[PDB]
Design a protein around this ligand. Sequence first.
Ligand SMILES: *[C@@H](CC(=O)N1CC(S(=O)(=O)c2ccc(N3CC(CN4CCC([C@@](C#N)(c5cccc(F)c5)[C@H]5CCC[C@@H]5NC(=O)OC)CC4)C3)cc2)C1)CN(C)C
Length: 481
Amino acid sequence: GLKAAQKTLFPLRSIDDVVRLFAAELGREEPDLVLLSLVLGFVEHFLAVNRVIPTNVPELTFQPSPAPDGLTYFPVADLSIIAALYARFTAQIRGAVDLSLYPREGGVSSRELVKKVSDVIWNSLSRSYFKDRAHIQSLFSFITGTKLDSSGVAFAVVGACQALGLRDVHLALSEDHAWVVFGPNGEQTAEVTWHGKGNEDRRGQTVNAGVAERSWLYLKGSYMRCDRKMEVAFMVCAINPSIDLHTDSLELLQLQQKLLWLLYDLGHLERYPMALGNLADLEELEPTPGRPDPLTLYHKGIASAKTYYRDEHIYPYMYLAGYHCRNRNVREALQAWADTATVIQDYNYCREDEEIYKEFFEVANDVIPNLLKEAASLLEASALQDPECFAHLLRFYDGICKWEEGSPTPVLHVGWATFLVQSLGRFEGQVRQKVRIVSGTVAGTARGPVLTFQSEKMKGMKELLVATKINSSAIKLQLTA
Ligand SMILES: *[C@@H](CC(=O)N1CC(S(=O)(=O)c2ccc(N3CC(CN4CCC([C@@](C#N)(c5cccc(F)c5)[C@H]5CCC[C@@H]5NC(=O)OC)CC4)C3)cc2)C1)CN(C)C
């Protein structure tokens, strides 16, 4: 439950008071996921969901403070409110699960116990709500309005176990899906939520099938297996500062940024590539004096993927690519998307991989065509003059092509083809000819850009791609096969 070491830090009257609770919690042997989720969820409710300060409520108060260009009001997180909310969740969990019926084999949770905790959270939810609704991720949401998004159900099942005393049960994460790891060596896996809009009830099953299938959703096995400190990182990354689609809460942005720096300094972001990208994103908006520059952090997110996850992740390269696209750095952006397709090349496109398909489809047929049209504008009184850009674009299509190989459903269709022709066309034949497409000559070493295609489709297209006159039909037909 809630002990004095936690309660004496209440009331949380400012942002620094929230960072203080989190600092203290990250120093305990077992940081309380429930209390930290409800707290984040309480400040988020008043800062983004419902900003209209209440009149009927007497217990609730707000804290004035000077805003940066009058006053800014903060929801005072009274111990009273939060404790009641904490007591509600524990009682609900404890009252539903009877651990005397489950035999703990020397501090080890069994599948049958895990699936029950999973069923408890699952059956507590409302029958009809929008799944992609913002701010339904925290435990505050689960208790106060009983709504949880896909990844939020997984964290609540981990939260609920820690309440029951189950320590071996941890959050498992890919780049678009969440589940649970448990057992005597943390090698047992279990599905606790749903993925996408409309699919079978995989809940309670192993993750083994998606790993062997070579789907991006299961990251060929190199996914994150969180410890308590990483589960806190997820929860912070899950703060949503959006008030609406155009405006965001400055305090929620400042909060998340302060929290990420706390987690970072303690080394808890070393095995979390996307949190580093998020930190960089926020550092570009409001930079913190005496801290690494966004690019340094973007590159730390990639470094983490390379070291701890066999370079099998897409988004650390997407985070960098977004940064360059924001600042019209065409070669640096095209380079990062080419790097992205180099990661996806060794995967196989499955039905459930629609989130990253939509991602590659937009860059190949909306974002890249928009950067090159803007580059063509500037040309009338440089990237289109750079042969290296052309190699990056070519390397990007090589990636999608290799991805399609061995996959059940097609990736490339008639819609992709026109934007390849059009994008090739933005590069002059003199520029395109400066790129040498070489298979290789001699293997290893003995004691004008060069490019090597890893896919059949692009290898067959070699001569057409470099030709002064682009044979549209031949490139369209070859890419569509
Ligand atoms: C030109 C273009 C430009 O700037 N654009 C287009 C590019 S892009 O390269 O197409 C591009 C860049 C960046 C992204 N981002 C998506 C975001 C990454 N993450 C993925 C995980 C996700 C989840 C969710 N939902 C999640 C779910 C399940 C399991 C998980 F592991 C994570 C969140 C759940 C709650 C927390 C978690 N977040 C998290 O782990 O870290 C934050 C969050 C989003 C990177 C996409 C595409 C950009 C510019 N001109 C127009 C000027």
